[PDB]
Amino acid sequence: LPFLKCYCSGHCPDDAINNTCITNGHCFAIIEEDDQGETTLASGCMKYEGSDFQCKDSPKAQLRRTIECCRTNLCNQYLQPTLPPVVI
Amino acid sequence: PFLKCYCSGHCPDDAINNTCITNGHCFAIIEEDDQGETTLASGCMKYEGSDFQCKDSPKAQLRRTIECCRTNLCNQYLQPTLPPV
Amino acid sequence: ETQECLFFNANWERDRTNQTGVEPCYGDKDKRRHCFATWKNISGSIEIVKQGCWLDDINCYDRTDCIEKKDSPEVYFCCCEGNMCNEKFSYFP
Amino acid sequence: TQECLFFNANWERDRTNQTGVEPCYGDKDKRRHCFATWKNISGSIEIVKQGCWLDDINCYDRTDCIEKKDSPEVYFCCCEGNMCNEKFSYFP
Amino acid sequence: KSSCKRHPLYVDFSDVGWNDWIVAPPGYHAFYCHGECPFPLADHLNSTNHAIVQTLVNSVNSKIPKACCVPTELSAISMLYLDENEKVVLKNYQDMVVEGCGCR
Amino acid sequence: SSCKRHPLYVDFSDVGWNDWIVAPPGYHAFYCHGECPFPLADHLNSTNHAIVQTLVNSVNSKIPKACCVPTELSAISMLYLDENEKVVLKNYQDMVVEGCGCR
Ligand SMILES: CC(=O)N[C@@H]1[C@@H](O)[C@H](O)[C@@H](CO)O[C@@H]1O
Ligand SMILES: CC(=O)N[C@@H]1[C@@H](O)[C@H](O)[C@@H](CO)O[C@@H]1O
Ligand SMILES: CC(=O)N[C@@H]1[C@@H](O)[C@H](O)[C@@H](CO)O[C@@H]1O
Ligand SMILES: CC(=O)N[C@@H]1[C@@H](O)[C@H](O)[C@@H](CO)O[C@H]1O
């Protein structure tokens, strides 16, 4: 749907202004733990097409990560995702 | 200074990535010079005196339209329209 | 700026096209437009091979005249910017 | 540079102290310096003033107080770091 | 971050050995696309649903490879060259220059 | 060009003050110069008066534009020789342009 503006960090297109991007889909924030246990945060824009899958994510992904999506102007900033429990 | 704005043409000489910070308003301005050559510019406006600047004078000799807003980056895709020719 | 070019096709009979005239140049999106000339030169005798429009090309940026600057080529070429700029062409090695 | 050696040859006229320690204050993160100023009469050193000196590009990243200008009527050096003006030298 | 993007490539016709064949241009900026396609696939990567699923499957099972960084928008150039009979041919070649890169 | 800070190193030899100032040999003073346009942006730290004057100039240019001047300055240490050839230490306030604005 919208003309949606999102913050981007780590996923910025090369023509981003003010670390923002525009989309017809969603803003996202993601916390992820790499294969060394270092945790990083990233954010950006996601196309509407395929967003059901990406916002859901797989609970069986090998690395710990949580993605959260929203559809309000720069709503990206208020997203504070938390890593899921370690699989024992 | 709690407000972040896009700036073009009105950047502080120390602007980081066309961004400025202020306690007042973001603005965009379209202005037509003498020959009809119109330009667009934007930036940050201090709260003090903003009543006057956001208002502008309709008796200005050059035609222009300034628009102000008070949310982060509300500035980036503001393109006001010149006063009725 | 470049909206039309001089057109020439020496192979017109085989190609079943036109031989000489004007060619309008169409661009992309906000890509530049250019004209070119290409010719042979047998000891001062100029034989035009092709003239027409040329797509956005960094080698043709801000060249208002059509000049071949390479040393004694076997097929001479120039491209330029500007309406009908391929109408006249020169050689300066 | 939190402190410097202080000297004022003019103390008796100025109604100040002659000699001691001077704490150096500076602005919003600007550098602080010490300085020495003296006269050399054929080899007999006569100190005129020592003290704190405000952020000055000519004193940046100097640990020693050396007068490098050729035989001046009044010698001067400035430096960076605590009490750096305690000892001063001359290399034209 | 070493993510899928456009990279510089100037195609110099001398370096390919096409100097005698191509009269113009002397070479051209082709560019190329390279880099990892991470999760999630961001808007400017213009991914298909399939690339999105494959990216998700790869994160569960590393034996399934990641999606690939390729050109998703390209532009044309003019070329002048000599044919078999030593005759000058003019062509506008489509899809010669990478304008945009994405995950497919 | 809009109101801003420009370079200016004051060399005491150049102005003929080498005989009088023992230190520093000179200093970056800077200066302010350039147009004060409508509107006056945040970093120009304008008064209400300069804003009103800018708008009046817009309506009739017989009224001059506001002017580009230092709005923040800093101090320097100087050592100099007085009328009796005695050395004097002074911190001079307001010597160096730190910021420019419209007034
Ligand atoms: C392709 C071709 O034969 N060219 C013709 C040209 O001769 C003429 O000027 C016009 C209509 O006849 O436009 C066509 O494109
Ligand atoms: C290519 C062209 O347009 N003409 C050139 C001309 O400049 C030159 O005087 C002559 C001798 O080099 O050769 C060609 O005839
Ligand atoms: C200024 C100072 O510290 N001492 C110097 C000393 O190095 C030099 O050899 C001599 C020359 O006359 O006397 C000077 O005063
Ligand atoms: C004139 C003057 O400032 N004298 C001061 C004095 O006030 C201070 O109590 C003492 C300790 O430092 O000696 C001097 O430094």
XYZ file of C-alpha atoms and ligand atoms in Angstrom:
625
model
C 0.000 0.000 0.000
C 1.526 3.279 1.324
C 4.346 5.681 0.499
C 6.203 4.470 3.563
C 9.356 5.987 5.030
C 11.643 3.818 7.204
C 14.933 4.152 9.016
C 17.677 1.995 7.535
C 20.942 0.831 9.085
C 22.865 -2.037 7.522
C 20.219 -2.440 4.778
C 20.342 1.041 3.224
C 20.049 1.374 -0.562
C 22.929 3.396 -2.060
C 20.613 6.409 -2.598
C 19.305 6.621 1.003
C 18.841 10.108 2.483
C 19.180 10.709 6.247
C 19.520 6.914 6.763
C 15.951 6.486 5.496
C 14.410 4.536 2.633
C 10.945 4.463 1.079
C 8.773 1.399 0.346
C 5.284 0.079 -0.418
C 5.726 -2.569 2.303
C 7.100 -2.473 5.861
C 9.750 -1.058 8.125
C 11.733 -3.643 10.024
C 14.236 -3.930 12.814
C 16.257 -7.086 13.372
C 18.590 -8.202 16.233
C 20.835 -11.023 15.196
C 23.612 -13.074 16.726
C 26.412 -14.073 14.337
C 28.290 -17.407 14.336
C 30.688 -15.918 16.939
C 27.989 -14.768 19.394
C 28.326 -11.076 18.558
C 24.907 -9.389 18.451
C 24.070 -6.583 16.021
C 21.038 -4.502 15.127
C 19.911 -3.612 11.621
C 16.881 -1.945 10.093
C 15.313 -1.059 6.773
C 12.488 -1.312 4.275
C 10.859 -4.535 3.074
C 8.748 -4.856 -0.146
C 5.147 -5.839 0.460
C 5.690 -8.889 -1.794
C 7.143 -11.751 0.290
C 6.752 -9.773 3.539
C 4.465 -12.404 5.136
C 7.436 -14.858 5.015
C 10.132 -12.359 6.077
C 8.165 -10.848 8.972
C 7.258 -14.348 10.177
C 10.852 -15.659 9.849
C 11.732 -19.321 10.575
C 11.880 -20.469 14.219
C 14.419 -23.071 13.014
C 16.991 -20.610 11.678
C 20.463 -21.762 12.794
C 21.402 -18.350 14.162
C 19.410 -16.533 16.859
C 17.602 -13.486 15.472
C 14.298 -11.630 15.874
C 12.782 -9.478 13.138
C 9.846 -7.146 13.840
C 7.832 -5.245 11.224
C 5.520 -2.220 11.271
C 3.736 -0.028 8.706
C 3.828 3.487 10.116
C 6.171 6.328 9.146
C 9.644 5.749 10.632
C 7.970 3.294 13.142
C 11.269 1.486 12.760
C 12.764 3.654 15.531
C 10.376 2.355 18.230
C 11.034 -1.337 17.495
C 13.207 -3.008 20.118
C 13.300 -6.706 19.212
C 14.767 -9.197 21.688
C 16.647 -12.423 20.703
C 14.670 -15.676 21.092
C 15.536 -18.242 23.834
C 18.564 -20.426 23.110
C 17.389 -23.791 21.756
C 18.441 -26.583 24.134
C 17.369 20.823 20.051
C 15.199 17.705 19.813
C 14.145 17.871 16.161
C 15.969 16.410 13.168
C 15.529 17.816 9.628
C 16.590 17.366 6.042
C 18.652 20.273 4.736
C 19.470 21.382 1.212
C 20.778 24.889 0.452
C 20.415 25.922 4.116
C 22.820 23.392 5.694
C 25.079 24.364 8.591
C 28.668 24.257 7.310
C 29.052 21.222 9.614
C 26.044 19.226 8.349
C 26.308 15.423 8.653
C 24.640 13.739 5.640
C 22.207 16.599 4.802
C 20.774 16.495 8.303
C 20.460 19.294 10.854
C 19.107 19.446 14.422
C 16.966 22.182 16.017
C 14.511 23.157 18.782
C 12.105 24.724 16.301
C 10.838 23.604 12.901
C 11.870 21.903 9.709
C 11.058 23.875 6.603
C 10.989 23.686 2.864
C 10.874 26.733 0.636
C 10.096 27.113 -3.052
C 11.084 30.480 -4.557
C 10.851 32.006 -8.016
C 13.607 34.484 -8.878
C 13.236 37.400 -11.342
C 13.364 35.318 -14.561
C 11.058 32.508 -13.496
C 13.940 30.223 -12.446
C 12.464 28.407 -9.393
C 14.530 26.648 -6.697
C 13.732 24.406 -3.725
C 15.626 24.536 -0.424
C 15.166 23.195 3.083
C 16.491 23.053 6.596
C 16.080 23.856 10.263
C 14.558 26.977 11.831
C 15.128 28.044 15.505
C 11.946 28.295 17.584
C 12.610 32.012 18.327
C 11.110 34.049 15.487
C 9.514 31.011 13.821
C 6.046 32.586 14.080
C 7.271 35.279 11.656
C 9.238 33.058 9.291
C 6.639 30.281 8.935
C 4.029 32.992 8.290
C 6.154 34.982 5.801
C 4.831 38.199 4.217
C 2.380 37.912 1.299
C 3.674 41.334 0.174
C 7.157 39.976 -0.530
C 8.412 41.105 -3.946
C 9.644 37.680 -5.065
C 7.089 34.898 -5.007
C 7.804 31.986 -2.718
C 6.124 29.570 -0.369
C 7.618 28.363 2.876
C 6.176 25.465 4.836
C 7.203 24.368 8.298
C 6.583 21.189 10.281
C 7.646 19.768 13.660
C 8.309 16.024 13.294
C 11.636 14.363 12.468
C 12.468 14.584 8.775
C 8.894 15.781 7.859
C 11.094 17.909 5.615
C 12.492 15.443 3.069
C 9.698 15.302 0.519
C 8.071 18.658 1.235
C 7.663 20.490 -2.044
C 5.435 23.539 -1.474
C 3.706 25.259 -4.387
C 4.403 28.873 -5.469
C 1.699 31.514 -4.765
C -0.990 31.730 -7.518
C 0.594 33.382 -10.603
C 19.195 19.295 -26.307
C 19.894 16.622 -28.952
C 16.466 16.003 -30.485
C 17.548 15.185 -34.040
C 20.580 14.174 -36.080
C 21.586 13.996 -39.687
C 21.051 10.477 -40.950
C 22.952 8.573 -43.616
C 23.056 4.906 -44.524
C 25.354 3.802 -47.368
C 23.845 0.272 -47.161
C 20.297 1.553 -47.661
C 19.613 -0.615 -50.761
C 20.594 -3.850 -49.014
C 19.015 -2.938 -45.653
C 15.829 -1.680 -47.390
C 16.011 1.529 -45.326
C 16.343 5.214 -46.164
C 19.596 6.738 -47.421
C 19.703 10.350 -46.163
C 17.655 12.698 -44.057
C 16.915 13.625 -40.477
C 16.680 11.236 -37.535
C 14.899 12.064 -34.278
C 16.735 10.867 -31.144
C 14.813 9.322 -28.241
C 16.250 8.901 -24.775
C 15.791 7.149 -21.627
C 15.383 8.679 -18.382
C 17.297 11.411 -18.251
C 19.968 9.744 -20.311
C 21.789 12.077 -22.717
C 21.338 11.873 -26.491
C 24.099 12.090 -29.115
C 24.835 12.140 -32.842
C 27.632 10.338 -34.630
C 29.369 10.387 -37.978
C 31.507 7.611 -39.419
C 33.446 7.699 -42.697
C 36.276 6.429 -44.882
C 38.977 8.694 -46.305
C 40.954 7.604 -49.387
C 43.724 10.247 -49.679
C 41.529 13.301 -48.991
C 38.429 11.792 -50.612
C 35.737 11.578 -47.904
C 33.287 8.652 -48.225
C 30.520 8.867 -45.573
C 29.474 5.459 -44.219
C 26.904 6.296 -41.503
C 25.376 9.180 -39.613
C 22.655 9.113 -36.986
C 21.672 9.065 -33.338
C 23.943 7.611 -30.681
C 22.932 6.464 -27.203
C 24.249 8.009 -23.978
C 28.031 7.627 -24.064
C 30.585 9.234 -21.743
C 32.939 9.658 -24.754
C 30.448 12.091 -26.312
C 29.663 14.251 -23.249
C 29.981 18.029 -23.817
C 31.411 17.711 -27.325
C 29.664 20.304 -29.463
C 31.734 19.514 -32.571
C 32.194 16.135 -34.260
C 35.952 15.421 -34.468
C 37.982 12.257 -34.980
C 41.070 12.617 -32.767
C 42.762 9.265 -33.457
C 45.789 8.963 -35.766
C 45.032 7.838 -39.341
C 42.269 5.285 -38.640
C 40.917 3.004 -41.373
C 37.330 3.892 -40.392
C 36.945 7.411 -38.961
C 34.421 8.120 -36.158
C 33.124 11.021 -34.063
C 30.190 11.639 -31.755
C 28.858 14.848 -30.240
C 26.020 16.497 -28.288
C 23.598 19.021 -29.759
C 20.854 19.161 -32.368
C 22.138 18.163 -35.844
C 25.769 18.200 -34.551
C 26.851 15.416 -36.963
C 26.037 17.582 -40.015
C 29.695 18.658 -40.282
C 32.708 16.653 -39.046
C 36.502 17.148 -38.818
C 39.846 15.353 -38.299
C 42.538 16.409 -35.774
C 44.946 13.552 -34.789
C 48.190 20.534 31.574
C 46.572 20.919 34.997
C 49.318 23.148 36.422
C 52.380 25.196 35.477
C 55.249 26.940 37.163
C 54.372 30.538 37.853
C 56.760 33.479 38.003
C 56.122 37.215 37.923
C 59.217 39.481 38.058
C 56.722 42.353 38.419
C 55.041 41.042 41.591
C 56.096 44.010 43.743
C 54.521 46.475 41.310
C 51.549 44.258 40.360
C 50.852 43.284 44.010
C 50.796 39.581 43.070
C 52.921 36.597 44.017
C 56.412 36.221 42.629
C 56.736 32.481 42.278
C 54.873 29.212 42.779
C 52.371 26.880 41.131
C 49.484 27.991 38.896
C 46.469 25.787 38.057
C 45.422 26.028 34.399
C 41.767 26.260 33.344
C 40.403 26.014 29.933
C 37.296 25.985 28.092
C 35.113 23.354 26.674
C 37.737 20.992 25.792
C 40.414 23.163 24.433
C 44.052 22.405 25.174
C 46.020 24.018 28.006
C 49.628 25.213 27.878
C 52.496 26.601 29.960
C 54.948 29.284 28.887
C 58.310 30.691 29.917
C 59.621 34.140 29.032
C 63.117 35.461 29.826
C 66.120 37.588 28.918
C 69.612 36.268 28.237
C 72.333 38.836 28.878
C 75.476 37.211 27.401
C 74.690 33.952 29.265
C 73.076 35.186 32.498
C 69.409 34.091 32.365
C 66.822 36.511 33.780
C 63.308 35.013 33.954
C 60.494 37.502 33.271
C 57.288 35.415 33.458
C 56.119 31.827 33.659
C 52.487 30.686 33.769
C 49.498 29.179 31.977
C 48.896 29.938 28.296
C 45.574 29.531 26.462
C 45.020 26.998 23.655
C 47.596 27.999 21.017
C 48.458 26.077 17.846
C 52.183 26.977 18.346
C 52.327 24.959 21.592
C 50.500 21.854 20.299
C 52.210 18.504 20.954
C 55.345 20.045 22.483
C 56.681 18.410 25.654
C 59.771 20.621 25.975
C 59.977 24.421 26.267
C 62.472 25.554 23.608
C 63.106 28.968 22.061
C 63.865 28.304 18.376
C 63.915 31.900 17.082
C 67.360 33.411 16.426
C 68.742 35.576 19.269
C 65.577 37.487 20.261
C 65.657 40.416 22.712
C 63.047 38.505 24.741
C 63.060 34.692 24.689
C 59.815 32.693 24.751
C 58.592 29.123 24.636
C 55.335 27.317 25.346
C 54.506 23.626 25.715
C 51.929 21.025 26.770
C 51.714 18.822 29.900
C 52.014 19.439 33.673
C 54.739 21.865 34.843
C 56.292 21.638 31.342
C 57.696 25.190 31.731
C 59.816 24.176 34.779
C 62.925 23.890 32.588
C 63.456 25.824 29.346
C 66.077 25.755 26.575
C 67.299 27.536 23.431
C 68.114 25.914 20.069
C 68.122 28.592 17.260
C 28.086 -5.165 4.554
C 29.696 -7.073 1.672
C 26.001 -7.332 0.747
C 24.671 -7.567 -2.821
C 25.543 -4.397 -4.752
C 26.819 -2.908 -8.001
C 30.608 -2.888 -8.478
C 32.780 -1.020 -11.005
C 33.790 -2.650 -14.267
C 35.128 -0.770 -17.246
C 35.208 -3.003 -20.312
C 38.230 -1.877 -22.324
C 37.996 -3.387 -25.824
C 41.836 -3.523 -26.064
C 41.979 -5.773 -22.982
C 39.525 -8.152 -24.668
C 41.343 -7.991 -28.029
C 38.459 -6.319 -29.878
C 40.268 -3.150 -31.004
C 40.337 -4.177 -34.680
C 36.698 -5.273 -34.618
C 34.894 -2.500 -32.693
C 35.253 0.997 -34.176
C 33.308 2.654 -31.323
C 33.191 2.979 -28.382
C 36.745 2.225 -27.153
C 35.187 0.574 -24.084
C 32.343 1.149 -21.657
C 31.290 0.999 -18.018
C 29.440 -2.360 -17.773
C 29.563 -2.753 -13.966
C 28.771 -6.089 -12.278
C 26.789 -7.304 -9.256
C 28.336 -9.078 -6.283
C 27.778 -9.808 -2.610
C 25.804 -11.914 -0.151
C 22.016 -11.965 -0.078
C 21.281 -11.889 3.669
C 18.104 -12.291 5.672
C 15.916 -10.274 5.348
C 15.946 -9.257 1.673
C 15.431 -5.483 1.684
C 13.099 -3.595 -0.666
C 15.861 -2.365 -3.039
C 16.937 -5.961 -3.720
C 13.657 -6.487 -5.662
C 13.516 -10.155 -4.704
C 11.065 -12.760 -5.867
C 9.043 -14.796 -3.394
C 11.295 -17.702 -4.382
C 14.536 -15.907 -3.447
C 12.879 -15.050 -0.130
C 11.940 -18.696 0.566
C 15.377 -19.958 -0.524
C 17.040 -17.407 1.831
C 14.851 -18.737 4.683
C 15.561 -22.405 3.818
C 19.296 -21.648 3.629
C 19.160 -20.193 7.175
C 17.660 -23.491 8.397
C 19.802 -25.767 6.168
C 23.164 -24.485 4.880
C 23.303 -27.144 2.130
C 20.687 -25.131 0.228
C 22.660 -22.229 -1.229
C 21.756 -18.569 -0.764
C 19.986 -16.523 -3.425
C 22.146 -14.786 -5.935
C 23.153 -11.168 -6.595
C 22.393 -10.341 -10.255
C 21.414 -7.332 -12.405
C 17.705 -6.537 -12.177
C 17.805 -3.386 -14.336
C 20.086 -2.811 -17.329
C 20.502 -0.187 -20.033
C 21.598 -0.096 -23.677
C 24.684 1.213 -25.532
C 25.466 2.024 -29.160
C 28.275 0.151 -30.903
C 29.874 0.415 -34.332
C 31.744 -2.681 -35.585
C 33.153 -4.442 -38.662
C 31.509 -7.591 -39.998
C 32.899 -10.598 -41.904
C 33.103 -8.552 -45.142
C 34.821 -5.591 -43.401
C 31.562 -3.582 -43.494
C 30.535 -1.142 -40.755
C 27.486 -2.271 -38.729
C 25.591 -0.056 -36.271
C 23.800 -1.658 -33.298
C 22.108 -0.561 -30.137
C 22.813 -3.453 -27.765
C 20.175 -3.905 -25.092
C 21.013 -4.884 -21.505
C 24.719 -3.952 -21.594
C 25.032 -1.849 -18.466
C 23.974 -2.752 -14.938
C 21.714 -0.052 -13.477
C 20.367 -2.032 -10.496
C 21.323 -5.216 -8.609
C 19.043 -7.578 -6.720
C 18.611 -11.013 -5.243
C 17.175 -13.775 -7.420
C 27.119 32.709 -0.888
C 25.352 32.542 2.515
C 26.626 33.935 5.859
C 29.572 31.855 7.076
C 33.059 31.810 8.630
C 36.018 32.401 6.280
C 39.743 31.911 6.965
C 41.986 34.748 8.192
C 45.334 34.195 9.865
C 46.624 37.426 11.401
C 50.400 37.375 11.125
C 51.945 40.022 13.357
C 54.831 40.613 10.904
C 52.305 41.427 8.153
C 50.629 44.146 10.260
C 53.958 45.462 11.572
C 53.517 44.387 15.209
C 56.571 42.113 15.503
C 58.387 44.807 17.542
C 55.634 44.905 20.122
C 54.136 41.422 20.484
C 56.602 38.772 21.644
C 54.017 35.947 21.360
C 52.177 34.433 19.580
C 53.714 35.115 16.110
C 50.098 35.371 14.873
C 46.753 33.585 15.106
C 43.718 32.399 13.151
C 41.158 35.127 13.759
C 38.718 34.168 10.991
C 35.951 36.492 9.772
C 32.254 36.314 8.907
C 30.848 37.140 5.481
C 27.911 36.365 3.188
C 24.228 36.987 2.539
C 21.550 36.649 5.187
C 18.635 35.155 3.190
C 15.004 34.444 3.947
C 14.472 32.368 5.995
C 17.269 32.624 8.531
C 18.200 29.057 9.472
C 18.845 27.762 13.003
C 22.660 27.954 12.815
C 22.528 31.736 12.090
C 21.244 32.312 15.643
C 19.214 35.352 14.641
C 17.336 37.751 16.895
C 13.658 38.502 16.293
C 14.819 41.884 14.955
C 17.064 40.390 12.242
C 14.158 38.111 11.210
C 11.697 41.040 10.935
C 14.289 43.129 9.038
C 14.893 40.235 6.589
C 11.142 40.099 5.935
C 10.952 43.905 5.555
C 13.849 43.772 3.084
C 11.776 41.148 1.133
C 8.905 43.652 0.835
C 11.085 46.678 -0.009
C 14.838 46.320 -0.559
C 15.540 49.967 0.426
C 15.578 48.415 3.902
C 18.917 46.556 4.120
C 19.322 42.854 4.817
C 20.501 41.718 8.231
C 24.211 41.350 8.537
C 26.653 38.429 8.969
C 28.714 38.816 12.171
C 30.485 36.710 14.861
C 27.965 35.364 17.389
C 30.455 33.305 19.409
C 34.102 34.198 20.040
C 37.057 32.834 21.976
C 40.132 34.259 23.693
C 43.902 34.127 23.159
C 46.978 34.634 25.333
C 49.367 37.361 24.255
C 52.705 38.591 25.529
C 53.641 42.156 24.574
C 55.906 45.098 25.453
C 54.380 48.200 27.070
C 55.363 51.893 26.775
C 58.378 51.256 29.047
C 59.565 48.082 27.226
C 58.260 45.858 30.041
C 56.573 42.568 29.127
C 52.858 42.236 29.835
C 50.789 39.047 29.838
C 47.146 39.320 28.787
C 44.356 36.990 27.764
C 42.454 38.889 25.093
C 38.756 38.080 25.020
C 36.700 37.948 21.795
C 39.639 37.475 19.398
C 38.619 34.380 17.440
C 35.375 33.748 15.542
C 33.881 30.435 16.714
C 30.478 31.007 15.063
C 28.813 33.409 12.610
C 25.182 34.533 12.485
C 22.750 37.138 11.217
C 22.020 40.259 13.258
C 11.769 2.971 -41.891
C 11.634 3.863 -43.097
O 11.546 3.362 -44.227
N 11.638 5.186 -42.864
C 10.484 6.072 -43.089
C 10.961 7.411 -43.684
O 11.329 7.192 -45.028
C 9.943 8.557 -43.688
O 10.601 9.786 -43.423
C 8.785 8.358 -42.698
C 7.487 7.867 -43.371
O 7.726 7.370 -44.677
O 9.175 7.556 -41.581
C 9.647 6.227 -41.806
O 10.393 5.819 -40.672
C 39.011 12.897 -42.162
C 38.663 14.225 -42.773
O 37.564 14.721 -42.516
N 39.550 14.827 -43.584
C 41.004 14.746 -43.474
C 41.651 16.133 -43.556
O 41.504 16.773 -42.304
C 43.143 16.136 -43.939
O 43.439 17.369 -44.562
C 43.582 15.008 -44.884
C 45.111 14.823 -44.861
O 45.406 14.094 -43.506
O 42.981 13.763 -44.550
C 41.558 13.785 -44.532
O 41.032 14.085 -45.814
C 68.197 30.955 26.496
C 68.860 29.806 27.213
O 68.151 29.001 27.818
N 70.202 29.701 27.177
C 71.032 30.006 26.012
C 72.194 29.027 25.854
O 71.695 27.795 25.388
C 73.224 29.580 24.863
O 74.293 28.662 24.714
C 73.783 30.934 25.318
C 74.056 31.878 24.146
O 74.417 33.153 24.647
O 72.943 31.561 26.282
C 71.542 31.449 26.069
O 70.901 32.100 27.138
C 47.811 38.157 45.405
C 47.452 36.690 45.468
O 46.664 36.244 44.628
N 48.026 35.951 46.447
C 47.766 34.523 46.659
C 47.012 34.303 47.961
O 45.716 34.835 47.811
C 46.953 32.812 48.299
O 46.270 32.672 49.524
C 48.352 32.207 48.464
C 48.439 30.710 48.110
O 48.681 30.478 46.719
O 49.368 32.973 47.820
C 49.054 33.677 46.624
O 49.041 32.762 45.542
